[PDB]
Write a protein that binds this ligand. Structure first.
Ligand SMILES: O=C(O)C1=C[C@H](O)[C@@H](O)[C@H]([C@H](O)[C@H](O)CO)O1
Ligand code: NA
Length: 380
């Protein structure tokens, strides 16, 4: 029934890499080679908060990387145009460290933002060469050299953020080395609990709005990069990035536990992050899913709808190719979706200029797309 309406789509770069005109810089003068790893949420004011990793010197997952963000200037503009967005701010950039994997969730008048961190001397694989010629040590299980999990919060509609608090000791398993939270988004259940996807576990926030305490729900067979969603039937669903290239890994259950993860052959994935959004719970209930709908590459970005009460089946949906955007490099990769006040899907989508090929010098930017259901429904 939302298919009857006139299609609407609109798209433009929102985080502009250093190689692009009007590159995004902080008010301090700090600029960024690349922006990756988007997260976006609509607050209960209707203001949109967009988060990313500002990777300072190159496009690598490690090294000096700051967690940055923008807000819409007003809570009512819905990010309609470029000028509707504030200029870049910083959640956390302290030291030479990696701060990233933004994974926010809105809770009434509090926005919670989980993030991952590592020391600037360490990388996932280790032995990587830093700007100064120093080789990274490999992420390990020491306090110094593990991936930490941090939580920061805003009670002023994303304007300011409390000093990030290290929650690794309580919300990551003891002994763990590599870790990820999201990235993308957590969710607030119909029943009021907050759920944050993370590597091998959900992170559950309980208590009144804005005064939460968190615990781990350890999962069996989950991915490192998960999405969480409350399907129309009320159940939870993890839809995760696979280890190897092929297809999304999916599991369903409740706060008491999830069933086994199993590959969803309806959802090809190239071992890349995806995003998911419960769009509405009234009839017809809809779940939206975005990812690169390919087994081998990140450039087949597709958005889809499921009408299933457990989101078992997604339609073909529509290729983001159908509304391509010039002057932003080759679009595709990590994504994040939110619903806007004016009833569109707002998505951040990574794009890669690909100048040094897959080398570290290739600049990465992030696109902001909006589209209504009609635009998805009425594609080939
Ligand atoms: O572009 C990527 O593939 C990527 C970028 C992120 O910054 C990394 O944290 C993440 C990680 O390397 C994998 O999830 C395997 O742990 O992957
Ligand atoms: Na930094």
């Amino acid at each position: 029934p939302a298919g009857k309406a006139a299609q609407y789509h609109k798209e433009y770069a929102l985080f502009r890499s250093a190689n692009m005109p009007s590159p995004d810089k902080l008010a301090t003068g700090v600029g960024f080679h690349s922006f990756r790893i988007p997260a976006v949420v609509r607050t209960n004011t209707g203001r949109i908060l967009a988060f990313a990793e500002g990777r300072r010197h190159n496009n690598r997952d490690y090294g000096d990387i700051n967690l940055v963000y923008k807000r819409t200037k007003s809570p009512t503009n819905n990010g309609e145009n470029p000028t509707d967005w504030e200029s870049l701010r910083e959640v956390v950039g302290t030291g030479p460290h990696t701060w990233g994997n933004p994974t926010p969730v809105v809770d009434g008048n509090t926005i919670y933002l989980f993030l991952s961190m590592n020391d600037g001397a360490y990388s996932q694989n280790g032995g990587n060469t830093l700007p100064d010629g120093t080789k990274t040590k490999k992420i390990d299980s020491t306090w110094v050299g593990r991936r930490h999990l941090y939580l920061t919060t805003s009670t002023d509609d994303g304007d300011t953020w409390t000093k990030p608090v290290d929650m690794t000791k309580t919300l990551t398993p003891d002994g763990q080395a590599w870790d990820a939270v999201g990235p993308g988004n957590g969710i607030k259940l119909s029943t009021g609990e907050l759920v944050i996807p993370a590597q091998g576990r959900n992170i559950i926030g309980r208590g009144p709005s804005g005064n939460r305490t968190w615990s781990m729900q350890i999962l069996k067979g989950a991915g490192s990069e998960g999405t969480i969603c409350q399907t129309p039937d009320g159940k939870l669903m993890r839809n995760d990035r696979p280890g190897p290239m092929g297809h999304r890994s999916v599991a369903r259950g409740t706060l008491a536990g999830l069933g086994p993860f199993a590959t969803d052959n309806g959802l090809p994935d190239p071992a890349c992050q995806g995003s998911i959004l419960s769009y509405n719970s009234d009839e017809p209930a809809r779940t939206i899913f975005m990812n690169s709908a390919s087994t081998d590459r990140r450039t087949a970005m597709r958005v889809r709808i499921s009408y299933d009460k457990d989101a078992a089946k997604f339609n073909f949906g529509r290729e983001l190719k159908d509304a391509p955007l010039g002057n932003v490099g080759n679009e595709g990769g990590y994504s994040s979706m939110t619903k806007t006040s004016d009833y569109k899907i707002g998505a951040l989508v990574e794009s890669d200029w690909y100048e040094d090929k897959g080398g570290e010098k290739s600049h990465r930017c992030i696109i902001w797309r909006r589209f209504n259901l009609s635009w998805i429904i009425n594609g080939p």
